[PDB]
Design a protein around this ligand. Sequence first.
Ligand code: 4WI
Ligand code: 4WI
Lengths: 296, 300
Amino acid sequence: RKMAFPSGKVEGCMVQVTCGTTTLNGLWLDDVVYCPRHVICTSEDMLNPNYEDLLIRKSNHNFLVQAGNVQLRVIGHSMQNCVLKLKVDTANPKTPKYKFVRIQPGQTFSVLACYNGSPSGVYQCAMRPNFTIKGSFLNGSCGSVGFNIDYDCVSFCYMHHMELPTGVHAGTDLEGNFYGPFVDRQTAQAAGTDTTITVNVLAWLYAAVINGDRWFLNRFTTTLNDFNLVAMKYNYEPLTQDHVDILGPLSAQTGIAVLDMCASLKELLQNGMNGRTILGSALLEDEFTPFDVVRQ
Amino acid sequence: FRKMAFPSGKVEGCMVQVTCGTTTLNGLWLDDVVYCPRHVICTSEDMLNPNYEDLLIRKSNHNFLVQAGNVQLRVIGHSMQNCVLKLKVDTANPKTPKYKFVRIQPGQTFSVLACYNGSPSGVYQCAMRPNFTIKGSFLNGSCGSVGFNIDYDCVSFCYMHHMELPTGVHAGTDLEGNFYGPFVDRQTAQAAGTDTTITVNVLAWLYAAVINGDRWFLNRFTTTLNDFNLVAMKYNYEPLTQDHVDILGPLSAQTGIAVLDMCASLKELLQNGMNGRTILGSALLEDEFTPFDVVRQCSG
Ligand SMILES: CC(C)(C)[C@H](NC(=O)C(F)(F)F)C(=O)N1C[C@H]2[C@@H]([C@H]1C(=O)N[C@H](C=N)C[C@@H]1CCNC1=O)C2(C)C
Ligand SMILES: CC(C)(C)[C@H](NC(=O)C(F)(F)F)C(=O)N1C[C@H]2[C@@H]([C@H]1C(=O)N[C@H](C=N)C[C@@H]1CCNC1=O)C2(C)C
């Protein structure tokens, strides 16, 4: 299964941030609360916000930060790209070992969706090639974060900011830089055409072989360029030599050369599943990374 | 629309490691009791045809090693309830949540916190299948992992993991040690029965599709429970009951599609398939969202 990481280490960091009439989630790590800067916007500000001007007018006491039933005293504030950093009185005693990481398209992570500072649910997802997330976010969900956990260290990679017209989601890393060409402004924008994460589909096919299914293999191989010429006709991402190298261990462990697995994928695209499933799915799964495969 | 699990933090603080001889699995630590599958008291060879009464008599407190992180918990008593072992320990879990033990029905969903060596590994959302199995993801050492729901700070534990059947699906007990399904904790040939699709959940998921603006499958027709159930039996779908209809009532009122109107859509989808089209991006009809699940996610 696509699994999320256990969310407890992040649940202990979620807080509520309110400025005027607008309330969203904040991330409380040590003595800083991170949250999307449009918390300082009213409704008349969303179309063309001047964030420098909106922020200079705020005092510390304009920011109401609540961690459960406890109010946290804001003692300083600062804007870093599209994220606000609220310095508070108190270091979060539940701060886990953590770091901030900016991820690349195709990378997976877990999302803890929150409202009013309290967690609602957790799910796994991927950063799409068009720098969006196929998330599940409602009003008040901004400031929810995405993360991985490695040896009890939480790497925060995503903070939620907005929803695009096709229902997909856009946000920033924890230094406030958007993924993709989006802005925290309620102006017309749209995700680029989204493609399938080819390297993840192939890793998942290798996972199927490791799991003992081989029905989709064939006797063909392919050059890299012929594979990409075919796959791009199905809106699959081009497979780079770096992707080929990445799959090397899985290729060695199964004895199926990467370009031979590429030939199998070409045939699967041409034929479909003919009523079969692969690892319990009737679709070609692309939100499972080569790293994820080895780690499960 | 995402398959979302509950936040797992309240449960993570209850997972411990239980070892009896060579056999190690996970245990659930609530106040001063650790709950785990009773087959922990088995050697590999015992598991082929165990006599649990006798194997438990021969054991003492000193046969059990319980580890909560870096800390050993001393076992001061032991007993069995059905297929669950209960280890009384010298220290009450200071992270014990408000909780209840509940037994769920086929078609109900829950989150699983997958654990190995007492350490939580991942969380995912599951349904109790009509054939009482669960389509989980469980490896060696996963026994004792639990499934749960949360309602307002109270964790309702409903599943504890015991075994994997030859089709790769899974069987376990409630926290009182009562099996779900006709399975026994013995390493002997057993198999999942033929499964069916959870009709009330497919309907809930069609309401979620409508809520999300996916409306092409709606049609002008209505049907009856009797007529729908005749086509349901044909396609290996759980018969739809009057309880299912009232349970769907709120979704029916939020969307303006009467429940019997939606059943006609599902009927049509079941016979003619899809014209290649998708619903919520899905090629198949999804049945692991309950009506409550759809309301929670669509309302936050
Ligand atoms: C969807 C809406 C048309 C309203 C708008 N979108 C676009 O303007 C775009 F289309 F350009 F993206 C949009 O998301 N916002 C408008 C305003 C913030 C953001 C916003 O309300 N964020 C919410 C945080 N709590 C999460 C949203 C709520 C609905 N579902 C979500 O995930 C900012 C971009 C500054
Ligand atoms: C799969 C195996 C053929 C080994 C066997 N299955 C059947 O005997 C069945 F077919 F009858 F079910 C089986 O699961 N067990 C045999 C033995 C316990 C159980 C068991 O090892 N449980 C594991 C607990 N850590 C979790 C398993 C590990 C693999 N994936 C899992 O989920 C008991 C039934 C007493």
